[PDB]
Design a protein around this ligand. Structure first.
Ligand SMILES: Nc1ncnc2c1ncn2[C@@H]1O[C@H](COP(=O)(O)OP(=O)(O)OP(=O)(O)O)[C@@H](O)[C@H]1O
Ligand SMILES: Nc1nc2c(ncn2[C@@H]2O[C@H](COP(=O)(O)OP(=O)(O)O)[C@@H](O)[C@H]2O)c(=O)[nH]1
Ligand SMILES: [Mg+2]
Ligand SMILES: [Mg+2]
Ligand SMILES: [Mg+2]
Ligand SMILES: [Mg+2]
Ligand SMILES: [Mg+2]
Ligand SMILES: [Mg+2]
Lengths: 101, 349, 161, 65, 208, 51
RNA sequence: AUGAGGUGGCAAGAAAUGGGCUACAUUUUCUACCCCAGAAAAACGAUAGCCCUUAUGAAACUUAAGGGUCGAAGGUGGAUUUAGC
């Protein structure tokens, strides 16, 4: 029942990345050192590449939790600028007020 | 203003009063090392009057009571920037020249550790670098300062320059000086030979030596000269600095190592660094130890009034308000009686 | 109620309180490094590696224990303490002492009287004041007063006044 | 939580693998968010991975197991 | 303007504040009494009661400034004054006693006189009669005259014709030329006057 | 580089404080920093981003 | 299937034009210092190009940083036009 298909894709990607975070962490740790043999590093590289694409953490997009806007999303509140402005103007966000100085 | 112009007789009675230098003495003793602004002032006024100050007087007392038998003593002039350390050293240099010493004058050791376009490799020691341009400049200046002693003093070794050219024992030091000057590539080697010969022969009573080094702190500091591979160079690699360090050791006798710290022109030092340790570092302070530090402080009110009167009589202070007591007070405040600040202010005032 | 910052525990102790000798104190200072504020004479250990506050507290106490015991302990390589590895300047066997000794030897040789030796020269009060001034300049902050004291000492030693 | 050396006894006592596992253990000890079980899981996974890849290690002259 | 309209510009003159109370006219005493109960701005960082303070040189330094580098501008100004004074002293000493009477060595006086010489008396302003603007000659206020003198001097110095010549020397040389009523600045002033005289026929196009 | 005494004391301090005892370059310290923190994916702010 | 999913791929310059950054230097450039210095000065001038390394990333010729390499156009700019009390 997510906002849109793009949000659904993002949710699936987040689930998968969380699921495979540990294995990616370990394999990337193997790849990211100058100590181990380079042959071992190469096999680690091919393996990490062989992991499913959607598990890549970078593929996660921080969309607005409410309207699925892919840009202009404040991380602290996870709300697009439009929705954040709506709520703040209606005074529904604690401690947020129009700035003047 | 003193009728006393002999640099030995004047003392505390002359403290705070001027001391004149004749044009011939200025040309001979001081072909270099005088502050650029003082050189300009002399050019403008046609006269060279240095106020007699307690630091110079005390250094003169020490040099008059110096026992040439004892190992050469190190005197170190230190003080806030623009306190007149360089000109006090020049005053003592003139006194020594009139007493007929041999003045080994380093106008500024800072120049020898920075901004060198021509930095070759020493032929005598392949691990050391040459500074031929500055070496030749200083050699010319030293020749001018000490021509009269130059011929009289003899060498005591065989000094090869090329695979075929050399200087033979008993040759006058003027031969070495001429070789260094005319042949720029051999300037560093000539400077080293000159320093070594003077240091050895001073212990033999052939003369009284005065090693007067301005900006002595440079020798044991850092240098802004980078190798061909952009590698930083430490001072010891520079033969000139190495030989000068050798000279700066009290191991010999028959002379005095007078030197002045000078933060101006220093490298990797804060602006306010003026104390001996602050300006020398561990290595420099240990090398100079033991030494006699002499403090050069800003003008006391009497000296300040004397300098203001000197400028007024020369007519330098053109501002119509300069002669007034209010103008004098304003100058005193804006300069805190500092010699350099007062001179710069009066320049445009 | 969880709060990640809640797990940090700080342990502050004045080294004066710890029963440490001179060598142990110096070794402990070198080991701790910036964790020791000399201005306040306070060693601070901030532990946040363990998840729990109790675990971090236990680890901080353990770190204090191990640091103290190793500081009192001694190791073979310690004997190779170069001058560049000391923070308290020691005039003894120092460059300044060697230089002043050589100067005194030169002065007395010029006097031609071989009534001299290391102990004889170093026993005089003049050397005592000179070394006091040199140590003060080297360790304590330098100023006009200290420089003047050093000047007087050097003048007295060199017999020039 | 901190002293994880006791878990490395299965790995070679010296060599590139030992150095790498020392780094890994240092990181795990500094990590506060993971449980002791999770840290042990990481180390055991590394052990199993190297055991399986032993052939490559021996061909490359790194002794293991 | 952070200063409200009530605030008045400070007056900085020790002589004015030390003037005897008896010498004050009714209006002057009233002015002092009014200022006793008035708001005054803070003394600007550019001026002080220093007897050596020169407003003309202060304004010249401000005009010479580039990007708020008051330090560099003041340094250039003092270097120019020192160079002028040194040149005058050299000429004085090298000159015979008779002409030494005329040779002047006060750099401030030289600067003031050079600027006064360079001041253009009559300017060219666009005046529109019937919908067409023409460059009518016109009298200028003293403020505009002084500003034009200073601006011409500074622009002439900044020109690129003098290459590898430091601003102190450039400005000292040009100031001496102007003092002796020669040089490109005086030439420019004469050119402006010549253009005005040529366009004298359009003077009536002015209405004020 | 460094005096032997100071280097040995630094290694001892690292051992006491639980840091890497062996010499190591930054390329390999990457491993330490990786394992010292939760992966971005594991962070609750990430995997629980959406309500 | 104008819906959903997967792989790959475009996102370039003939050329014009808008805004900004860099400069055309001597009130400049480098060094030290943060304002009393020493050198440079036909050199000034790229954040452009090419090569290498590194950071992040699974993926870097194409993203960013650093270094090396090259020292290019340019020499205060037309009418016109922007901002500032
Ligand atoms: N005895 C003197 N006679 C004339 N002028 C003097 C005298 N002493 C100092 N001055 C003036 O002060 C300057 C000389 O002082 P000097 O530059 O040597 O000072 P300093 O303390 O060594 O400063 P720095 O920080 O540059 O080393 C010159 O401007 C000179 O006009
Ligand atoms: N070329 C040359 N230089 C000499 C000679 N004697 C002295 N010098 C100069 O002084 C240096 C040698 O001084 P010396 O007392 O041998 O000490 P060193 O420099 O430490 O070897 C040389 O590097 C030169 O600068 C000589 O015979 N030939
Ligand atoms: Mg992204
Ligand atoms: Mg000086
Ligand atoms: Mg579709
Ligand atoms: Mg480039
Ligand atoms: Mg990579
Ligand atoms: Mg170039």
């Amino acid at each position: 029942h997510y906002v849109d298909w793009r949000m659904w894709r993002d949710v699936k990607r987040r689930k998968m990345a969380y699921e495979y975070a540990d294995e990616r962490l370990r394999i990337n740790s193997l790849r990211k050192n100058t100590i181990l043999p380079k042959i071992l590093q190469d096999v680690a590289d091919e393996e990490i590449a062989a992991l499913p694409r959607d598990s890549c953490p970078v593929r996660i997009r921080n969309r607005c939790v409410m309207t699925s806007r892919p840009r202009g999303v404040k991380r602290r509140w996870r709300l697009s600028r439009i929705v954040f402005r709506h709520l703040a103007d209606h005074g529904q966000l604690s401690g947020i007020q129009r700035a003047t100085w | 203003r003193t009728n006393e112009n002999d640099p030995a007789k004047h003392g505390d009675q002359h403290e705070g009063q001027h001391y004149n230098i004749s044009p011939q003495d200025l040309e001979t003793v001081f072909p270099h090392g005088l502050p650029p602004r003082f050189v300009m002032q002399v050019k403008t006024f046609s006269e060279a009057c240095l106020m007699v100050r307690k630091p110079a007087l005390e250094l003169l007392h020490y040099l008059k009571n110096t026992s040439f038998a004892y190992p050469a003593i190190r005197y170190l002039l230190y003080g806030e920037k623009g306190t007149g350390k360089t000109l006090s050293l020049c005053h003592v240099i003139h006194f020594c020249a009139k007493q007929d010493w041999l003045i080994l004058h380093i106008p500024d050791a800072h120049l020898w550790v920075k901004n060198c376009r021509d930095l070759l490799q020493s032929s005598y020691n392949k691990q050391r670098f040459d500074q031929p341009l500055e070496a030749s400049t200083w050699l010319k200046n030293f020749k001018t300062t000490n021509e009269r002693f130059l011929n009289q003093i003899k060498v005591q070794e065989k000094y090869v320059w090329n695979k075929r050219e050399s200087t033979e024992k008993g040759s006058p030091l003027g031969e070495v000086v001429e070789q260094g000057i005319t042949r720029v590539r051999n300037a560093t080697d000539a400077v080293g030979i000159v320093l070594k010969e003077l240091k050895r022969q001073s212990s033999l009573g052939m003369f009284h030596l005065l090693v007067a080094v301005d900006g002595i702190n440079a020798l044991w500091g850092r240098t802004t000269l980078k190798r061909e591979d952009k590698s930083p160079i430490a001072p010891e690699e520079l033969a000139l600095v190495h030989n000068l360090r050798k000279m700066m050791k009290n191991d010999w006798h028959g002379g005095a190592i007078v030197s002045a710290l000078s933060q101006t022109g220093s490298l990797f030092k804060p602006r306010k660094a003026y104390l001996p340790q602050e300006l020398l570092g561990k290595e420099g302070f240990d090398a100079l130890d033991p030494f006699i530090p002499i403090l050069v402080s800003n003008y006391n009110p009497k000296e300040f009034e004397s300098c203001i009167q000197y400028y007024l009589e020369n007519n330098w202070l053109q501002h119509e308000k300069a002669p007034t007591e209010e103008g004098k007070k304003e100058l005193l405040f804006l300069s805190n009686a500092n010699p350099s600040l007062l001179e710069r202010h009066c320049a445009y005032l | 109620v969880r709060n990640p910052r809640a797990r940090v525990v700080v342990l502050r102790v004045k080294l004066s309180s710890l029963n440490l000798d001179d060598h142990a104190k110096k070794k402990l200072i070198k080991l701790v490094g910036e964790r020791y504020c000399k201005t306040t004479d306070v060693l601070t250990i901030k532990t946040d590696r363990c998840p729990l506050r109790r675990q971090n507290y236990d680890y901080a106490v353990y770190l204090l224990t191990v640091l103290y015991h190793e500081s009192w302990n001694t190791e073979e390589w310690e004997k190779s303490k170069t001058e560049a590895d000391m923070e308290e300047y020691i005039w003894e066997n120092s460059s300044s002492e060697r230089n002043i000794l050589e100067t005194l030897l030169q002065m007395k040789a010029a006097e031609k009287n071989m009534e001299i030796n290391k102990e004889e020269l170093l026993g005089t009060k003049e050397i005592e004041e000179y070394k006091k001034s040199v140590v003060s300049l080297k360790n304590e902050e330098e100023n006009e007063n200290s420089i003047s004291q050093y000047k007087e000492s050097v003048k007295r030693l060199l017999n020039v006044t | 939580h901190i002293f994880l050396e006791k878990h490395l006894e299965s790995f070679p006592k010296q060599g590139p693998i030992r150095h790498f596992m020392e780094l890994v253990t240092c990181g795990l000890s500094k990590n506060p968010y993971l449980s002791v079980k999770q840290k042990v899981e990481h180390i055991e996974w590394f052990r199993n991975y190297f055991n399986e890849k032993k052939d490559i290690l021996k061909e490359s002259n790194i002794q293991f197991n | 303007s952070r200063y409200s309209p009530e605030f008045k510009d400070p007056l900085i003159d020790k002589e004015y504040y030390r003037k005897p109370v008896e010498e004050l006219t009714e209006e002057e005493k009233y002015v002092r009494e009014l200022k006793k109960t008035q708001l005054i701005k803070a003394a600007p960082a550019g001026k002080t009661s220093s007897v050596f303070e020169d407003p003309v040189i202060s304004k010249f330094t401000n005009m010479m400034m580039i990007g708020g580098n008051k330090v560099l501008a003041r340094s250039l100004m003092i270097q120019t004054l020192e160079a002028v004074k040194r040149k005058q002293f050299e000429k004085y000493h090298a000159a015979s006693a008779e002409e030494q009477a005329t040779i002047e060595r006060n750099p401030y006086t030289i600067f003031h006189q050079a600027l006064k010489n360079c001041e253009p008396m009559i300017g060219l302003v666009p005046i529109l009669k019937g919908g067409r603007f023409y460059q009518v000659p016109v009298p200028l206020p003293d403020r505009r005259r002084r500003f034009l003198a200073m601006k011409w001097m500074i622009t002439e110095c900044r020109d690129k014709k003098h290459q590898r010549t430091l601003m102190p020397e450039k400005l000292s040389h040009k100031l001496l030329e102007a003092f002796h009523n020669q040089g490109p600045v005086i030439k420019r002033k004469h050119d402006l006057h010549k253009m005005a005289e040529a366009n004298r026929a359009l003077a009536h196009y002015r209405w004020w | 580089s460094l005096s032997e005494y100071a280097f040995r004391m630094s290694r001892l301090s690292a051992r006491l404080f639980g840091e890497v005892t062996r010499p190591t370059n930054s390329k390999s310290m990457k491993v330490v920093k990786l394992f010292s923190e939760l992966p971005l994916a594991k962070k609750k702010e990430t995997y629980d981003w959406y309500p």
